[PDB]
Design an enzyme around this catalytic site. Structure first.
Site, mmCIF file in Angstrom:
data_model
loop_
_atom_site.group_PDB
_atom_site.id
_atom_site.type_symbol
_atom_site.label_atom_id
_atom_site.label_comp_id
_atom_site.label_asym_id
_atom_site.label_seq_id
_atom_site.Cartn_x
_atom_site.Cartn_y
_atom_site.Cartn_z
ATOM 1 N N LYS A 246 0.830 -1.201 0.000
ATOM 2 C CA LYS A 246 0.000 0.000 0.000
ATOM 3 C C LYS A 246 0.869 1.256 0.000
ATOM 4 O O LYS A 246 0.399 2.348 -0.320
ATOM 5 C CB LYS A 246 -0.907 0.014 1.237
ATOM 6 C CG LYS A 246 -0.153 0.139 2.549
ATOM 7 C CD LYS A 246 -1.068 -0.074 3.751
ATOM 8 C CE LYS A 246 -0.286 0.024 5.055
ATOM 9 N NZ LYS A 246 -1.121 -0.389 6.221
HETATM 10 N N1 LIG Z 1 1.140 -8.458 -1.595
HETATM 11 C C1 LIG Z 1 0.131 -8.946 -0.862
HETATM 12 N N2 LIG Z 1 -0.513 -10.052 -1.296
HETATM 13 C C2 LIG Z 1 -1.536 -10.528 -0.564
HETATM 14 N N3 LIG Z 1 -2.046 -10.061 0.577
HETATM 15 C C3 LIG Z 1 -1.377 -8.967 0.979
HETATM 16 C C4 LIG Z 1 -0.305 -8.365 0.340
HETATM 17 N N4 LIG Z 1 0.138 -7.264 1.054
HETATM 18 C C5 LIG Z 1 -0.665 -7.216 2.088
HETATM 19 N N5 LIG Z 1 -1.610 -8.212 2.103
HETATM 20 C C6 LIG Z 1 -2.661 -8.422 3.097
HETATM 21 O O1 LIG Z 1 -3.436 -7.237 3.162
HETATM 22 C C7 LIG Z 1 -3.811 -6.970 4.542
HETATM 23 C C8 LIG Z 1 -3.289 -5.612 4.943
HETATM 24 O O2 LIG Z 1 -1.882 -5.672 5.162
HETATM 25 P P1 LIG Z 1 -1.028 -4.341 5.335
HETATM 26 O O3 LIG Z 1 -1.870 -3.320 6.004
HETATM 27 O O4 LIG Z 1 0.307 -4.676 5.894
HETATM 28 O O5 LIG Z 1 -0.809 -3.813 3.806
HETATM 29 P P2 LIG Z 1 0.669 -3.797 3.113
HETATM 30 O O6 LIG Z 1 0.469 -3.428 1.687
HETATM 31 O O7 LIG Z 1 1.373 -5.058 3.464
HETATM 32 O O8 LIG Z 1 1.422 -2.539 3.822
HETATM 33 P P3 LIG Z 1 2.965 -2.641 4.339
HETATM 34 O O9 LIG Z 1 3.910 -2.591 3.157
HETATM 35 O O10 LIG Z 1 3.248 -1.459 5.251
HETATM 36 O O11 LIG Z 1 3.164 -3.937 5.108
HETATM 37 C C9 LIG Z 1 -3.291 -8.151 5.355
HETATM 38 O O12 LIG Z 1 -4.302 -9.146 5.476
HETATM 39 C C10 LIG Z 1 -2.127 -8.654 4.509
HETATM 40 O O13 LIG Z 1 -1.821 -10.019 4.721
#
Ligand SMILES: Nc1ncnc2c1ncn2[C@@H]1O[C@H](COP(=O)(O)OP(=O)(O)OP(=O)(O)O)[C@@H](O)[C@H]1O
Ligand SMILES: [Mg+2]
Length: 468
Positions: A246
């Site tokens: 994100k």
């Molecule tokens: N690349 C990805 N593929 C699948 N699920 C994901 C992925 N990135 C995050 N998620 C899922 O999305 C949800 C939100 O996770 P999170 O808020 O950490 O977003 P993020 O994109 O990983 O942000 P950050 O880089 O700070 O970790 C969680 O259930 C996480 O497992």
């Protein structure tokens, strides 16, 4: 009976990763005639965002998914918000203490930092505090956490349904914190207690949680409970093979909605992330996905989530899946948002028909065809210069158009054809300046279809304005 779940954290925007994981949980449950439940992981009182829960729930429904138990719909095994079951985690943590599977640790942050640098991580030294002494210190109000007492030495075997069994040396598993000093649980304790009490039989989550599984298996063993089946979905990747984040790209489902992506298209695209249809079809319904679902067809490689491919699918849905009338209905909210109206449904249908081959998202329609709904449309710098270059030609043409009785695509085309020959120029030299004058753009659908759409009078009016 199969019971799956999703445990989203309301810490911001509804994440596409959540939709992805939810989609597979929903499909596995429906394919087996089971249940899919939603449980809100809202223990992080630091990252909590008001309205985030509602937005995630709305996004799942927007995508076409449905759930059987949750915060709003209710259910037989609630509460469905972890913040509403804080007493349960504390009682289960106490049960682990009673069984010798957990212990209270009183180290301060400074102490933990020193131990971490000395040993490489917390070394479980608090396990050597006499149990009765630990209880007394706790009773006196000394701050502490409750950690898992991993068997040292030992090994823990864990099975992921898609990859197989992994034998972990317990040395790789730390005495993780289960209950924080503020009384709140960590995911390790919460997920196990709640999946068990809610009857979850199949835990399907992102692969980044795979290495955490031996901790959960140890907890199920500690409580004397049966561990559920575990399935770790490959992470969504950027074209460059890096994990989608994100912080690096658009992951908000609300952003996709606001940008004009159709929920059926986005859902269809997420279906292709960790799965392929036997015949290889790329365009299919949610029901077809469920009917064809099998773990044998779920790839382990990292699925590439490409916005360009998504946009392509969105456009293919717009001009090949939906009807002209369905498309017309869906662009309405976007027209209103752009502050535009439409004389009639028949007129709107026509405008959509003319533009259909030119836009991939609903938001692009009002943007690219603004001149069809109002006189207050922008005139590009390139279109203005072209209009200026052909102004003398348009000036001479104006009288012909004004005296033009037959106002149809064919008649208008014939008129400009004759005019160009008369002036010794190619049709294109006349056509382009005219397009700029009537639309303020150099890229639009058939010039002659547009010139006849509004009508002679309405067309002449706008032309005079451009010639003035
Ligand atoms: N690349 C990805 N593929 C699948 N699920 C994901 C992925 N990135 C995050 N998620 C899922 O999305 C949800 C939100 O996770 P999170 O808020 O950490 O977003 P993020 O994109 O990983 O942000 P950050 O880089 O700070 O970790 C969680 O259930 C996480 O497992
Ligand atoms: Mg993350």
């Amino acid at each position: 009976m199969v019971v799956t779940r999703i445990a989203p954290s309301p810490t911001g925007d509804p994440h596409v990763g959540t939709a992805y994981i939810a989609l597979f949980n929903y499909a596995w449950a429906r394919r087996n005639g089971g249940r899919f439940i939603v449980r809100i992981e809202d223990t992080d009182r630091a990252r909590y965002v008001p309205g985030a829960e509602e937005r995630i729930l709305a996004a799942l429904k927007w995508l076409g998914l449905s759930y059987d138990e949750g915060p709003d719909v209710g259910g037989p095994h609630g509460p469905y918000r972890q913040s509403e079951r804080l007493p349960l985690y504390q009682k289960y943590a106490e049960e682990l203490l009673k069984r010798g599977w957990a212990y209270r640790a009183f180290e301060t942050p400074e102490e933990l930092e020193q131990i971490r640098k000395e040993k490489g991580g917390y070394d479980g030294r608090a396990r050597n505090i006499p149990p009765e002494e630990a209880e007394e210190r706790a009773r006196r109000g000394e701050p502490h956490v409750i950690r898992l007492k991993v068997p040292r030495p030992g090994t823990t075997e864990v099975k992921d349904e898609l990859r197989g069994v992994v034998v972990y040396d317990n040395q790789e598993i730390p005495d993780v914190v289960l209950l924080k000093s503020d009384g709140y649980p960590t995911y390790h304790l919460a997920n196990v207690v709640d999946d068990h009490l809610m009857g979850v039989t199949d835990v399907i989550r992102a692969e980044e949680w795979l290495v955490s599984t031996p901790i959960h298996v140890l907890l199920y063993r500690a409580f004397g409970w049966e561990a559920p089946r575990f399935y770790h979905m490959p992470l969504l990747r950027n074209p460059d093979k890096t994990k989608i984040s994100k912080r690096k790209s658009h992951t908000s489902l609300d952003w996709y909605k606001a940008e004009g992506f159709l929920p059926e298209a986005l859902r269809n695209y997420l279906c292709l992330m960790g799965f392929s249809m036997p015949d290889g079809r790329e365009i299919f319904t949610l029901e077809e996905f469920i009917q064809a679902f099998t773990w044998e067809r779920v790839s382990l490689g990292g699925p590439v989530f490409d916005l360009e491919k998504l946009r392509w699918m969105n456009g293919k849905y717009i001009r090949e899946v939906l009807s002209l009338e369905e498309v017309a209905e869906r662009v309405k909210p976007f027209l209103r948002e752009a502050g535009l109206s439409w004389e009639s449904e028949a007129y709107l249908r026509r405008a959509v028909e003319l533009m259909r081959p030119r836009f991939d998202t609903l938001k692009e329609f009002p943007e690219k065809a603004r001149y069809l709904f109002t006189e207050d449309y922008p005139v590009s710098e390139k279109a203005q210069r072209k209009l200026e270059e052909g102004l003398p030609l348009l000036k001479e043409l104006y009288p012909r158009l004004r005296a033009q009785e037959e106002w149809t695509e064919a008649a208008l085309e014939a008129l400009l054809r004759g005019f160009a020959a008369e002036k010794g120029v190619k049709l294109g030299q006349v056509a382009q300046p005219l397009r700029a004058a009537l639309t303020g753009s150099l890229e639009t659908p058939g010039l002659f279809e547009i010139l006849a759409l509004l009508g002679k009078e309405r067309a002449l009016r706008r032309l005079e304005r451009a010639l003035a």
